[PDB]
Design a binder for this molecule. Structure first.
Ligand code: ATP
Ligand code: K
Ligand code: K
Ligand code: K
Ligand code: K
Ligand code: K
Ligand code: K
Ligand code: K
Ligand code: K
Ligand code: MG
Ligand code: MG
Ligand code: MG
Ligand code: MG
Ligand code: MG
Ligand code: MG
Ligand code: MG
Ligand code: MG
Lengths: 119, 124, 50, 402
RNA sequence: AAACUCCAUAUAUAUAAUUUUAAUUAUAUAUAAUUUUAUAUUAUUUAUUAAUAUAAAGAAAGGAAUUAAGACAAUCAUAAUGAUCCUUAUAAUAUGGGUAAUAGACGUGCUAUAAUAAAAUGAUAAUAAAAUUAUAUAAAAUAUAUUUAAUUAUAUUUAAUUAAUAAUAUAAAACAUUUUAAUUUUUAAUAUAUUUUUUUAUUAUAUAUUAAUAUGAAUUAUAAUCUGAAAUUCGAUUAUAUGAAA
């Protein structure tokens, strides 16, 4: 098991895929740039990394907006909608779809995740 | 009077027949040779990737046991690989009768001289 | 010479039946490939006609 | 575990390649491949010699998907229009730079294996790059070397150097005394902590010693440049440099590797690419006049205007996008005076010889032996194979159960 | 009713100065089958017979429309006639809103829940048919996303064609190569090999785990674009991020 910034990774996992899977705010394109910047070859796996290289990943990850910081940006944008009294803000408060979806049927996911304190 | 004129080889010894299957059509040139086949100017293995399509083309020649006695220049258009391969099969059988009209009965019995009528039917 | 030769068989009835049972969605070529590859592995271990 | 020690767990293509299914094959006694006595083996199926098999297995001459598991050992038909024609040009032509072409499955790899067999017999040192995709797919480590100004690939280089050592006769390698002194960092786990470096003095150590140097991954690029330089300066032993699936190199100008700016790395910025194209272009000249460079394309790779233009088969179209036309590769190929040898398709008599060998190997189905006349079988299999394609011939015989 | 008739299919003639090219075609006319014959067997109303098989000839194998009654259903937002009611309003126009609300329930679809199956790549370009383009179809090129290029999206520009001519539009699957979590069935370091794109040996390669991954793409944040006078309720597309249920 390789631990980067608390996240645990299985040795066989490909670094560029693992980074975009466990870290909030990092996708496929962002993960590839991090690996390219650190000199990791495209299909290198976690078990190959050395401790100096594990620290380099944590350094580059700590200079980005990820995890709590990224999640806070979404929670604060949603809160602003409620503060100004916009139609979208009310939908977030009522746990209803906010993008024009019909509610006579379906709308189950919006009733499950839409909230001012969105995860 | 009748509307049928005896079919004969052309000035270059070639028997020309047309065949149709589904939406595909094939015009083949059969001449006495050594078993060389060309489909739209391309090698048989190149144009037809499926071995079952290749075996369909060879079947009429296998019935008269003349697989190595003729050169075939097949030109095909329309439909897909199966329609074209079987349209070529039908056209070779119709072109082989000129070389020996005594083998028509064997070709008919094998089923290679019958035009397959099945086509995509608009649901009714 | 041909009068006494049986018309060669267009296809093997058993193999054609097995192929169609494997086949789904009209993908006969894949079904034929699977059967041929399986029968190729039978020959390479038994060295008899699969 | 679900997988037992002998369970067949891989896919079909890897199982046939790796499952050792030739063990049950019947031993047949065939003549041996010898170009010096080709008159006795022309148009006949031959096995390779024991010295040739050992070298060709270490070079990667035999590949998967060649139905090699049907026979005890890989066999080849000595052909007049392909094998004899190519080997005579290789012995006579002064330039000795060839690229083998032909339709997919025509037998381009087998021809290259027969050229490797000739080289082994004729006391030559063979450097083979069987699968160039391994250094272009981005699945092994890469590092930038400041002294070479190239991206070196240590993991790949370690495998390549061992292949050059295990596939070639030690006596030939020992004959080439070193021309310069070399110093490398010591990675031998026995004395690495005692001796910081390993020195190779000139006129005392040989190229055999150079191929056995255990160095650190960061100094392995400088070891590959020394090996090539030593083999290109000596005039004692001819060097046969071969690259199979060269079409991959021509059509993949940019590797999967990315630099620190997330920019894909040009293939000529890799040492393997630079080294390969230096030998082909003529930049790296070999002192011995019997040294050759045989390239072979593969039908598994995409095609574009690069190779046809380099060979003079089509005019240069300047408005073709770089993804379909690489003008730099064309310049390198034309600077090296590389000539094309198109592998012809099999004739009906050659098909007869191959099908007669297959009958003796017991690989033919009972529907092609019982109740079928021999002449009918040859004509049918010559028609179903596209009039000569060796791969379509084998498939029609052993992989067509319909 | 059936016959007949038309369509399809096979064939013949005619037409095309074979660059509007697909002549392997187009569409006018005609012909063909509701097939025919011999033979053996089994039945029969046993004869000039059906069911069968055998042999021979044949391209011949599929559809369409079709009478009048009787009994019954629908407002037809798919046409009427009368009666009946409104006539400063139950008629007419404008602005905005609604028809898109959301507890539960039901119908019909779409995409999924991985290895007989998904994802990439395939340029002298594998292989279609039927349609559309004067209230238009929009090529190639260039620019940006964006990276050598390709790919995808939009912008710039508006070539050709109002068409068997040019455009929408290089069909797709197929096939080949590569890759693929669960899976220590992997990967890596050494050594090893006559499996070398690979074998074997020794070490490390995590645990968690009936479970949701490199499956899945719902939901959501931000930025940009398209149509339109206008995209807030309430449209479409793209990028980065998010990654639910199953
Ligand atoms: N001379 C020969 N003798 C025996 N078998 C041969 C010969 N030439 C080709 N074959 C067989 O034909 C098949 C294809 O051969 P090979 O792999 O050399 O072809 P290729 O053209 O290099 O293929 P690709 O285009 O995929 O690279 C194999 O089964 C091989 O054994
Ligand atoms: K992520
Ligand atoms: K709504
Ligand atoms: K519903
Ligand atoms: K024409
Ligand atoms: K509305
Ligand atoms: K799948
Ligand atoms: K098309
Ligand atoms: K809107
Ligand atoms: Mg090859
Ligand atoms: Mg409604
Ligand atoms: Mg095409
Ligand atoms: Mg364009
Ligand atoms: Mg295509
Ligand atoms: Mg595809
Ligand atoms: Mg669940
Ligand atoms: Mg996905």
């Amino acid at each position: 098991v390789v631990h980067i910034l608390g996240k645990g990774f299985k040795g066989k996992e490909v670094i560029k895929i693992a980074l975009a899977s466990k870290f909030y705010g990092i996708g496929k394109t962002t993960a590839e740039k991090i690996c390219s910047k650190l000199g990791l070859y495209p299909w290198m796996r976690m078990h190959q990394l050395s401790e100096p290289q594990i620290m380099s990943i944590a350094s580059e990850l700590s200079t980005m907006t990820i995890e709590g910081d990224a999640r806070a940006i979404v929670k604060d944008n949603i809160a602003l909608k409620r503060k100004i009294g916009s139609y979208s803000g009310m939908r977030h408060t009522l746990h209803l779809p906010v993008r024009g979806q019909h509610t006579r049927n379906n709308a189950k996911t919006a009733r499950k995740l839409n909230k001012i304190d969105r995860r | 009077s009748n509307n049928i004129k005896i079919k004969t080889l052309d000035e270059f010894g070639r028997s020309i027949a047309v065949g149709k299957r589904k939406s595909s059509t094939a015009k083949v040139f059969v001449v006495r040779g050594t078993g060389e086949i060309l489909v739209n100017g391309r090698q048989l293995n190149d144009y037809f990737l499926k071995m079952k399509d290749r075996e369909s083309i060879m079947y009429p020649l296998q019935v008269i046991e003349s697989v190595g006695k003729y050169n075939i220049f097949a030109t095909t258009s329309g439909g897909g690989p199966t329609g074209q391969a079987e349209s070529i099969m039908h056209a070779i059988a119709k072109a082989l009768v000129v070389f020996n009209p005594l083998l028509k009965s064997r070709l008919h019995k094998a089923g290679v001289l019958t035009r397959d009528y099945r086509h995509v039917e608009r649901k009714k | 010479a041909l009068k006494s030769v049986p018309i060669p068989p267009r296809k093997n009835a058993t193999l054609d039946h097995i192929t169609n049972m494997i086949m789904r969605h009209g993908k006969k070529e894949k079904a034929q490939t699977i059967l041929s590859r399986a029968l190729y592995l039978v020959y390479c271990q038994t060295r008899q006609d699969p | 575990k679900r997988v037992t020690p002998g369970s067949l767990y891989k896919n079909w293509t890897n199982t046939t390649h790796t499952a050792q299914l030739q063990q049950t094959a019947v031993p047949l006694a065939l003549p041996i491949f010898n170009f010096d006595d080709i008159s006795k083996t022309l148009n006949k199926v031959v096995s390779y010699s024991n010295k040739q098999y050992k070298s060709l297995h270490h070079l990667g001459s035999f590949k998967k998907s060649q139905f090699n598991e049907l026979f005890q050992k890989p066999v080849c038909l000595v052909r007049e229009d392909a094998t004899n024609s190519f080997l005579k040009k290789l012995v006579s032509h002064p330039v000795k730079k060839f690229i083998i072409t032909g339709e997919p499955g025509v037998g381009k790899t087998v021809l290259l294996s027969q050229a490797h067999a000739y080289a082994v017999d004729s006391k030559q040192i063979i450097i083979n790059i069987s699968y160039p995709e391994l250094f272009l797919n981005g699945r092994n480590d890469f590092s930038y070397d400041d002294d070479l100004k190239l991206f070196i690939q240590p993991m790949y280089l370690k495998k390549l150097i061992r292949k050059i050592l295990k596939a070639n006769d030690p006596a030939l390698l020992k004959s080439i005394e070193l021309s310069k002194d070399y110093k490398f960092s010591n990675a031998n786990p026995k004395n690495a902590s005692v001796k910081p470096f390993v020195t190779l003095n000139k006129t005392k150590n040989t190229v055999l010693d150079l191929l056995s140097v255990m160095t650190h991954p960061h100094n392995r690029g400088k070891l590959m440049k020394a090996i090539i330089d030593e083999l290109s300066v000596q005039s004692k032993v001819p060097i046969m440099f071969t690259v199979d699936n060269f079409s991959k190199v021509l059509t993949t100008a940019y590797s999967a590797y990315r630099n620190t700016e997330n920019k894909q790395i040009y293939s000529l910025d890799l040492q393997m690419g630079k080294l390969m194209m230096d030998i082909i272009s003529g930049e790296t000249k070999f002192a011995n006049g019997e040294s050759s460079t045989i390239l072979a394309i593969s039908g598994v790779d995409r095609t574009n205007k690069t190779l046809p233009v380099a060979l003079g088969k089509i005019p240069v179209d300047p408005y073709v996008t770089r993804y379909h036309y690489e003008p730099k590769f064309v310049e390198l190929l034309q600077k090296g005076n590389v000539t094309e040898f198109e592998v012809p398709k099999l004739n009906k008599q050659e098909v007869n010889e191959l099908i007669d060998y297959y009958k003796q190997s017991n690989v033919l189905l009972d529907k092609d032996i019982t109740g079928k006349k021999w002449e009918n079988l040859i004509d049918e299999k010559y028609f179903l194979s596209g009039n000569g394609n060796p791969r379509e011939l084998l498939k029609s015989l052993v992989l067509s159960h319909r």
